Each structure stands twice: as C-alpha cells, then as structure tokens.
Design a protein around this ligand. Structure first.
Ligand SMILES: Nc1cc(Br)ccn1
Ligand SMILES: [Cl-]
Ligand SMILES: [Cl-]
Ligand SMILES: [Cl-]
Length: 163
C-alpha cells in the first residue's frame, strides 16, 4: 500500500505515466482502438495478447513485468443511460479488484467512457464518481490522466473538495 494513499490528476499522455501499472480504456475485442487505447497499444503492444474481455470487466495482461489493466467501459451510443451507468460502475469495481490483487502502490487511470464511448455527452462527474466509489477502499496512490485543461481543473477541484 501507499503510506498516505492519495488522488492526483495530471494533464498528459497516460503512456508516459510514473505509476506501477496502467489502466487502459479498452474495447471489448482487444483491438488497438483510438485515444487512450491507441497510446496504450503503441507503448505496451505485448499487453494486447488475449486482452479481449466483456463490457463492465477488467482483464490484466503483463507487458514484461508492467501490468496493463484493460478496463472496458460501456459505449453510451449502444447502452441506455441506466444500463451504461451500471456497466461503467462495474468496470471500475473490477479495476479496484485488479489493482488490489497486483499489490501495486500506484496506478495510472483514465476516465472510462468520457471519450468516443461518451455518446457525445460530458461524463466527467459520472465517470470520476464511479472511479472514487471503486478506488476509495484501495490503498494505492491513484493518478488520473486527462488531456483537456478545463477537465484537469474540474478533476483537481473534485479531488480537493473531499480532502
Ligand atoms: N494518451 C492519452 C489520451 C487521453 Br484522452 C488521456 C490520457 N492519455
Ligand atoms: Cl504529453
Ligand atoms: Cl472512451
Ligand atoms: Cl480529457
């Protein structure tokens, strides 16, 4: 565990993270995909061996000894708001199980279902709150990666508001 488990946010490529493992915003078929998934494929291509896993689940594959936790958030184009909400919460619970099982002291994590799976909606708050629900009982240092300056501000504010 981390000595004083924390949340942090950084605005940069999750492929350049400084943590002991990474969560991929994966697709169910283990394809190279777009956005976070394509950056992860470029950095850790070996981790996409048998990475396919259903919506609402996480599957870890090692790239050398570095764990890549493939977390499949729902595509809100396909799911109802209600079913999508349930699957998004579930993907993060499976990430918390994997992070715990791996025994890491830190994890780099994107906001699931906020990009091309958002169904063209702003899901920062919805995705972040599910992240907190899952990860709050873990003792890993959590570092959330984003690319948008205003998202960075909002995420930082949401973290600081609970400290
Ligand atoms: N490569 C990336 C892309 C996004 Br979106 C967030 C973090 N890292
Ligand atoms: Cl960068
Ligand atoms: Cl996404
Ligand atoms: Cl972002």
């Amino acid at each position: 565990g981390a000595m004083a488990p924390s949340y942090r946010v950084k605005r940069m490529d999750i492929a350049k993270n400084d943590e002991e493992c990474v969560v991929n915003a994966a697709n169910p078929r283990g394809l190279p995909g777009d956005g976070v998934c394509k950056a992860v494929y470029k950095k850790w291509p070996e981790s996409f061996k048998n990475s396919a896993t259903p919506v609402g689940t996480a599957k870890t594959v090692m790239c050398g000894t570095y764990p890549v936790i493939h977390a499949v958030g729902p595509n809100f184009s396909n799911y109802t708001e209600s079913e999508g909400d349930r699957e998004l919460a579930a993907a993060y619970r499976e990430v918390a199980k994997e992070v715990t099982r791996l025994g890491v002291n830190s994890v780099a994590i994107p906001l699931l279902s906020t990009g091309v799976y958002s169904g063209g909606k702003d899901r920062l708050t919805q995705s972040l709150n599910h992240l907190f629900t899952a990860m709050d009982s873990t003792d890993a240092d959590v570092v959330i990666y984003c690319r948008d300056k205003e998202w960075e501000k909002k995420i930082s504010e949401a973290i600081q508001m609970r400290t």
